[PDB]
Amino acid sequence: AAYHIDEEVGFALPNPQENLPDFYNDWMFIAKHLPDLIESGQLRERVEKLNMLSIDHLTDHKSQRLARLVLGCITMAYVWGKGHGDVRKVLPRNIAVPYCQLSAALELPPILVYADCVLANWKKKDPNKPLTYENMDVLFSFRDGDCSKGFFLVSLLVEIAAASAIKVIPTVFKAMQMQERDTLLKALLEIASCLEKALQVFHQIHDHVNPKAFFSVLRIYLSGWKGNPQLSDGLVYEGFWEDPKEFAGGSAGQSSVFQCFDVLLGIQQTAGGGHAAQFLQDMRRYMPPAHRNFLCSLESNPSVREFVLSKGDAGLREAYDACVKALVSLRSYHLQIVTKYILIPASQQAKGTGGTDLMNFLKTVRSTTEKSLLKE
Numbered sequence: 001a002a003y004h005i006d007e008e009v010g011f012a013l014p015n016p017q018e019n020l021p022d023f024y025n026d027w028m029f030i031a032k033h034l035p036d037l038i039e040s041g042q043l044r045e046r047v048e049k050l051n052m053l054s055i056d057h058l059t060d061h062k063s064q065r066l067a068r069l070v071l072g073c074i075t076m077a078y079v080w081g082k083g084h085g086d087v088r089k090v091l092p093r094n095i096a097v098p099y100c101q102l103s104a105a106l107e108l109p110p111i112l113v114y115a116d117c118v119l120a121n122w123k124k125k126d127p128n129k130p131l132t133y134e135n136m137d138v139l140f141s142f143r144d145g146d147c148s149k150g151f152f153l154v155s156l157l158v159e160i161a162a163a164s165a166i167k168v169i170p171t172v173f174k175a176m177q178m179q180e181r182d183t184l185l186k187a188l189l190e191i192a193s194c195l196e197k198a199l200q201v202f203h204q205i206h207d208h209v210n211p212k213a214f215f216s217v218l219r220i221y222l223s224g225w226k227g228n229p230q231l232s233d234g235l236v237y238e239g240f241w242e243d244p245k246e247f248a249g250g251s252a253g254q255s256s257v258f259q260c261f262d263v264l265l266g267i268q269q270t271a272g273g274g275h276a277a278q279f280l281q282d283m284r285r286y287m288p289p290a291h292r293n294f295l296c297s298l299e300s301n302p303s304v305r306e307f308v309l310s311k312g313d314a315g316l317r318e319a320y321d322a323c324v325k326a327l328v329s330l331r332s333y334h335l336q337i338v339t340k341y342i343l344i345p346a347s348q349q350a351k352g353t354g355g356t357d358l359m360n361f362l363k364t365v366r367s368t369t370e371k372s373l374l375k376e
């Protein structure tokens, strides 16, 4: 509510803006034509010829969100080029400066993130039909046959499915705060079901995303410069920071959906000095700031886990366990997705060298989720 959470679409930006003020057309034209401009070897040339446009004409939140998307898309294309190794280590001043300033205003790092290319990058084809794949579209793509429509929309359609679980979270805390045993139990059962529906939405990834396309084309435009050998020291945001800075690649791992129900269930992923807790805390740096606050204010609330154990209630424990189980399913299925779209295409013809780091990260987080089951 005050954490920029929509009841219909959750962490997704409701009805995002598609057009920037005519003042920014030179940006909009480049971003809308990245498939051709990258194809024809012209993208870097047009970026380097841009003037510097003041960000003072981005008048409202949704317009700044759209412009972060345009500039984020232009940056990725510029840095990565055609994605065959010939990279760019200096983002020109005429983009670097307005982008860094706009990102500082929005409290996001100056790199493309999930909130840009999934949460803000969509529209209904017909605004009176409902939110289904057939009635939506993304607003930007990088290459012909990069399956960005399928990967962004389905990631987004999962976000929407999670929203029906998220709009219950107040009812859970109100239930506790008033000792409403049955209200609490139905809320948790409802959350578990919504999360089970989310898992079903996740299945549509196979209909709309080709593994070779993802691993070989879309994964390139989504890669950052933070522990990247190709940009060992980060990117120079010319005219804004004297020294190159390092920013993580925009993944789905930036989604607030898994952490939101980790925090709500008292599952302590982001607890410790371990490497998995770190990456999860890091990824919060890459989320919209209203959602960064939502997660922290959830950790500050009285624990669901502690209350269900305090009551000697098989009922609440089953329902709380139903949610914990749903989370384990999502991560299990999510591990099966990672194997299809990254693990297998890697071992042909690129983190987790041989599999080691990627898989063991996601396995670790799933295991922490497993051990949280109350059972008894």
Ligand code: HEM
Binding pocket: 151, 154, 155, 156, 158, 159, 205, 249, 251, 252, 253, 254, 255, 257, 258, 259, 280, 331, 334, 337, 338, 341, 342, 351, 358, 362, 365
């Ligand atoms: C469909 C193809 C997908 C692929 C190939 C993929 C890949 C990955 C990768 C590589 C990571 C590790 C972080 C990194 O290395 O940057 C990760 C973690 C993660 N992913 Fe995805 N992802 C996909 C879809 C999704 C979707 C649809 C969601 C949620 C709506 C999601 C949510 C997450 C989360 C939350 C993490 C962090 C681990 C955790 O918190 O449990 N992913 N994924």
Ligand SMILES: N[C@@H](CC(=O)c1ccccc1NC=O)C(=O)O
Binding pocket: 050, 051, 052, 053, 054, 094
């Ligand atoms: N006026 C700036 C130059 C600059 O940043 C710039 C680059 C391209 C097009 C216009 C520019 N001037 C003001 O935004 C200066 O004094 O360095």
